Amino acid sequence: QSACTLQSETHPPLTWQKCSSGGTCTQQTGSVVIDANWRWTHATNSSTNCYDGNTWSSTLCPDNETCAKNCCLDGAAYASTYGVTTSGNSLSIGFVTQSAQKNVGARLYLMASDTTYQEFTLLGNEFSFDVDVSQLPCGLNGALYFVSMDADGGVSKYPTNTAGAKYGTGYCDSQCPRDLKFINGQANVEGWEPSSNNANTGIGGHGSCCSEMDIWEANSISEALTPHPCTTVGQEICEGDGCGGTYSDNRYGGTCDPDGCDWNPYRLGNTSFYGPGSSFTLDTTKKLTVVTQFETSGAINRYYVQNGVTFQQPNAELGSYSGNELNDDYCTAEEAEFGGSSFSDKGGLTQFKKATSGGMVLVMSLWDDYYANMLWLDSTYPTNETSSTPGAVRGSCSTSSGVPAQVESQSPNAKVTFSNIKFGPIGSTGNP
Ligand SMILES: *[C@@H]1O[C@H](CO)[C@@H](O)[C@H](O)[C@H]1NC(C)=O
Ligand SMILES: *[C@@H]1O[C@H](CO)[C@@H](O)[C@H](O)[C@H]1NC(C)=O
Ligand SMILES: *[C@@H]1O[C@H](CO)[C@@H](O)[C@H](O)[C@H]1NC(C)=O
Numbered sequence: 001q002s003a004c005t006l007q008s009e010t011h012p013p014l015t016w017q018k019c020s021s022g023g024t025c026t027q028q029t030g031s032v033v034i035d036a037n038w039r040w041t042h043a044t045n046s047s048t049n050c051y052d053g054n055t056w057s058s059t060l061c062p063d064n065e066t067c068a069k070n071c072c073l074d075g076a077a078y079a080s081t082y083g084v085t086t087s088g089n090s091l092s093i094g095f096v097t098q099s100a101q102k103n104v105g106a107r108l109y110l111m112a113s114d115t116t117y118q119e120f121t122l123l124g125n126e127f128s129f130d131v132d133v134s135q136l137p138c139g140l141n142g143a144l145y146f147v148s149m150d151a152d153g154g155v156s157k158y159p160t161n162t163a164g165a166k167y168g169t170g171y172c173d174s175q176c177p178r179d180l181k182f183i184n185g186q187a188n189v190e191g192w193e194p195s196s197n198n199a200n201t202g203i204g205g206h207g208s209c210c211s212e213m214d215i216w217e218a219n220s221i222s223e224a225l226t227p228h229p230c231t232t233v234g235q236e237i238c239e240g241d242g243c244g245g246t247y248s249d250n251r252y253g254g255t256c257d258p259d260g261c262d263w264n265p266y267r268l269g270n271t272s273f274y275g276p277g278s279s280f281t282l283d284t285t286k287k288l289t290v291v292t293q294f295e296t297s298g299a300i301n302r303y304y305v306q307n308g309v310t311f312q313q314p315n316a317e318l319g320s321y322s323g324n325e326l327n328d329d330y331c332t333a334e335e336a337e338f339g340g341s342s343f344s345d346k347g348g349l350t351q352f353k354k355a356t357s358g359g360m361v362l363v364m365s366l367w368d369d370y371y372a373n374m375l376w377l378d379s380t381y382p383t384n385e386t387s388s389t390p391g392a393v394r395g396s397c398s399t400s401s402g403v404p405a406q407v408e409s410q411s412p413n414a415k416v417t418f419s420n421i422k423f424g425p426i427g428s429t430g431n432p
């Protein structure tokens, strides 16, 4: 697709800190851009919609190539349409915003320039941020994560995409998402199946796969840390059912690991570690600092800070594993005790180190879950199991509280605020 300018595109600014092993941090001035799927897609020379509700125009978009020639992405009114604001080093993402249409959440990328995403090399480095999850009930996910996207949004590889990173093109993740309207500079109208439960979304014939480091998927009840390897490290189109992920009949049927090697303290039996109020170690009614280190072995270390008090990731005992580091032993013990083979079949922490040794793009988002109702994060899951099934209980939420119709009507002013991003060598993000 191309870009149109019926609405001007002004990327909300966002500062962050780049830290050095020399004992200092220096402020960077970046900006954020909303993903192209959230934008108005219309004809290049009129206000006629290419996509509206959850169907495409038959005349403008008869096939994937024709649609991309005929259609453009427009600008975003960040605050009034999407409930997205920034304030210095802080980014606020709102949940439901009713304007002319219903908007639900947003997915945003950190930019390095008007036309490029900021790339981070995570291996041997650490990433720190602060987060307020107090306004995120059961069913929501305020996510901060990294994906192996191209820095330019795909423009150099797929020159039929001229909108680029300036308009939030190029998304991929370990779910091989098929709900994307544009992939590889073509539309995704071929095979488009409107969602029966969502008047604004559907599933197309193609998807967009890549490695995903979920630093933070969380709400006020539960939080999880999860690397997802893929057999191709970076962005790759997939076809139909071959995609696997959330949007295919068989989630395990593709090139990416949709489950990952996850560490959720509640799931591991530490049920007083993270939650709302004074009975929890980390009180989710207040802002929290989350620090994540990518050790050179491929292991991942985690600690937290709240009200000036530091807490390491709590220890877990799982089978023969005892410790508090997300490492090979943990991920092996997790598959043994809880089940699954997708993480190890996709190459585990060794294949994952290929992603973190390269560049990844920072993503911040808020979403509800029309497919699994976030029960994997904060409830008992899978829902054919019981509390006695090892690893089934991940939080205290009810089965039905994360149904989108419920959370969108009950908690429309839910929101997440991410702030004070700092990045640098291991041990450097506490620097002034
Ligand atoms: C708008 O652009 C299309 C090509 O995408 C062109 O075929 C169409 O006729 C144009 N509209 C006019 C001339 O009104
Ligand atoms: C949970 O973690 C905290 C570590 O901050 C600790 O004080 C508490 O003993 C742990 N509870 C468990 C392992 O059940
Ligand atoms: C739950 O369903 C999964 C697959 O959908 C199956 O592997 C498992 O055996 C089922 N367990 C029970 C207890 O029904």
Ligand SMILES: [Gd+3]
Binding pocket: 295, 301, 325
């Ligand atoms: Gd260590």
